[PDB]
């Protein structure tokens, strides 16, 4: 198994502290398949069902069971091995394109 | 204080560390997030390594494959240095290749 670009994955969130409860969190994979396999990292954007109309929220579209918004400005390269990533879903191509567009705007 | 694009900042770590800020200035100020890549003295020759350039005290490579958006205030971000524009462009060039 390796995460694919466009996948919705569940990642272990395992803080050793803080008020936020440990557990699995959904996120969208925006990094290339080959990157993910070779580095053992995956660049991901968190997914949430809290919809505030925040400018960097990208609505999840083209899925089977997954709802909510992607938070594009929270983009992170995460260790999908250590965090035991599991692919549970996937989004549309234009969903990924929208998120990546936001990120590239942020870093340019 | 706010992190600027091109800044080398020190960040608190977890289970202080240098990182390059690639996110836009106004983005860092408004959102409270900084998109950064870690800098390391180990040169392993990975294809995603970018050599640091145009700096005073800072050496090593920037890891584009480890890019993270983080809360810079919560990590007590402080700017100790900066890098050349061509350096940021190269890092950002690698990141966009990764996610496209």
């Amino acid at each position: 198994y390796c995460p694919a670009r466009g996948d919705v994955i569940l990642l272990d969130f395992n803080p050793q502290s803080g008020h936020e409860q440990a557990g699995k969190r959904p996120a969208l994979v925006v990094s290339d398949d080959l990157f993910n396999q070779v580095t053992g990292f995956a660049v991901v954007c968190p997914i949430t069902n809290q919809i505030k109309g925040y400018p960097f929220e990208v609505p999840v579209d083209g899925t089977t069971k997954t709802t909510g918004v992607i938070l594009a400005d929270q983009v992170k390269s995460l260790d999908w091995k250590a965090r035991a990533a599991r692919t549970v879903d996937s989004v549309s191509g234009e969903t990924v394109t929208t998120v990546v567009d936001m990120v590239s705007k942020i870093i340019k | 204080y706010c992190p600027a694009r091109g800044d080398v900042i020190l960040l608190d770590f977890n289970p202080k560390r240098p990182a390059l800020v690639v996110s836009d200035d106004l983005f860092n100020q408004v959102t409270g997030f900084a998109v950064v890549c870690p800098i390391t003295n180990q040169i392993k020759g990975y294809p995603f390594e970018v050599p640091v350039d145009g700096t005073t005290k800072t050496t090593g490579v920037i890891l584009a494959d480890q890019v993270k958006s983080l809360d810079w205030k919560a990590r007590a971000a402080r700017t100790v240095d900066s890098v050349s524009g061509e350096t940021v462009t190269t890092v950002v060039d690698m990141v966009s290749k990764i996610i496209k």
């Binding site: 990642l11 272990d12 969130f13 395992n14 803080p15 050793q16 803080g18 936020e20 969190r25 996120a27 053992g40 990292f41 991901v44 968190p46 949430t48 809290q50 505030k52 109309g53 925040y54 400018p55 960097f56 938070l71 929270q74 992170k76 390269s77 995460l78 260790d79 091995k81 250590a82 965090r83 936001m102 705007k105 942020i106 | 960040l11 770590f13 977890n14 289970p15 560390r17 990182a19 836009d24 106004l26 983005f27 408004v30 959102t31 409270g32 997030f33 950064v36 870690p38 390391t40 890891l63 480890q66 993270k68 958006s69 983080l70 809360d71 919560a74």
Partner: peptide, 29 residues
Amino acid sequence: PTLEELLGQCTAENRHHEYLCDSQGKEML
């Protein structure tokens, strides 16, 4: 839209806490 245009609509009511703020395994930061 433009980064400026995007950033212009950020508010106090709008913003999100940082998800997945922990560091695991290989992560440097």
